[PDB]
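Sample 1 of the test manifest.
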Amino acid sequence: SVNTANANLSINTSSTGISIQSASTGLTVTSNAGNGQAFQHDQPYLVFRVFVKV
Amino acid sequence: SVNTANANLSINTSSTGISIQSASTGLTVTSNAGNGQAFQHDQPYLVFRVFVKV
C-alpha cells in the first residue's frame, strides 16, 4: 500500500493589479448665500422750508 | 520504494471582489468672491441757481 502523504506546496505573493475608475462627487449646485434685506441710501440733500402764498 | 515527484498544480485567476466605500469630497465652503467698494449713482438731475432775498 502506498502510504498517504502531501506535496510540500507554498504560494508566493502577487499584486492584484486592481484599478479604480473615474467618478464624480455628483455636486450640482452650491447652497445659497445672501439675505437681500432693505438697504438705506440718501442723495446729497439740503433741507429747506416751503410756504404757500395766501 | 517510490521515487519522489511533484503534483501537477495550477492556480486559476480570480477577481478579488474589491468594493469602494462611500466618501465625501471633504470641502464645505467656497472662497470669497465679491469685492466691496462704493459706486456712483445720482437721480435725474437738473441745476438751478439759488438766490436769498435780502
